[PDB]
Amino acid sequence: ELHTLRYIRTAMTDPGPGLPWFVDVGYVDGELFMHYNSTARRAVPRTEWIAANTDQQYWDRETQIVQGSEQINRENLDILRRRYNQTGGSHTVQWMSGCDILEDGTIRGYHQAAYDGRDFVAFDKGTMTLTAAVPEAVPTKRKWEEGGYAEGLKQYLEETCVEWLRRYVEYGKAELGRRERPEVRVWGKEADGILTLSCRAHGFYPRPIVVSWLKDGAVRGQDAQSGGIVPNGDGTYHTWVTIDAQPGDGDKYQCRVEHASLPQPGLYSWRSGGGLND
Amino acid sequence: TNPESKVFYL
Amino acid sequence: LTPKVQVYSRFPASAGTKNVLNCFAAGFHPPKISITLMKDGVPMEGAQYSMSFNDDWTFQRLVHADFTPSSGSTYACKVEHETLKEPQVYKWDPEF
């Protein structure tokens, strides 16, 4: 029952060649659904469930508000450069916004910004004031206290953003809840007296996966090295887990895959071989 | 929905 | 921060069968990154990109292109960054 919503903005000075300077991406439970770039200047749907449940009037309003923030983030790059006394080069203004509906029923809303990687400003819900991390972020709080932008942000993070997220889950009930079985491949490579056993999982949904190596039916978590969960072009995920072993012991090793699509943890061997062993 | 342009002023 | 890059295929490798060659780079700053997919040291045709970042402000980018694996042909991914000095190239293996 844990549902997440995130709208990530990026304002860049150096994109560089043939790339957009302003990029705004929207997410529902990790899955991409909203996209915006400074070149196209339009808010377009990425997945099928949003376009089927929303009209053009929705996307027309979604374009103008991000187009307005694009102009605000354009001047923000110049205001922040003068505070640090910088002529120009590579400077980035990042933004994080959205709500997290917990399994119990508690609402958690976030709204924060960062300059050149390091934290700049963050909004506090239990105080209704903007928190400044760096000494250069002090004039930002003075601007927020003058206009009173915190009041409009409070009603958004507590109601507007929450009400829409509840609908997004209902709209993509079939896509987000669907499980995808991964194609497992077990490999091995000999270098200098050591055999490097590799295990790859191809195309799986959702993102959480536990891929661990076994020796004689016993887990070797320390000896196994993982590359992390990497995403594919179609929306699916990939994972790479490697282990070092002595030559003539490769067949004694087994790859364990724990996924939502599988009822029990799938055990795969090199000579078996891999996912095609049924 | 995306937040209003007003909440991005620095 | 230096990018953590890895090259991988969408579907399991097969001779004379269409596949997608992915190259994912993560944990880097500034966002300006040059990711190019290669075939025998020559850049691959029809390369498509994804800008995104994690909760810890670290940037991420995926570069993918449709291809057919050929025997005797080497597939790799070249990554250029200001923190790297020398470009790091990651080799793709069909049976690894």
Author numbering:
A (entry chain A): 1 to 278
B (entry chain C): 1 to 10
C (entry chain B): 2 to 51, 53 to 98
What's written in the study?
Highly polymorphic class I molecules encoded by the major histocompatibility complex (MHC) are crucial in the adaptive immune response to viruses and some intracellular bacteria, binding peptides inside the cell and presenting them on the cell surface to CD8 T lymphocytes. In contrast, chicken TAP genes are highly polymorphic, with each haplotype encoding a TAP molecule with a peptide-translocation specificity matching the peptide-binding specificity of the dominantly expressed class I molecule encoded by the BF2 gene, with the BF1 gene expressed poorly or not at all. In this paper, we find that two other haplotypes known to confer resistance to Marek's disease also have low cell surface expression and promiscuous peptide motifs, and examine the structural basis for promiscuous binding in three low expressing molecules. Second, we show that peptide-binding repertoire and level of cell surface expression are inversely correlated in both chickens and humans, indicating that this relationship is a fundamental property of class I molecules.
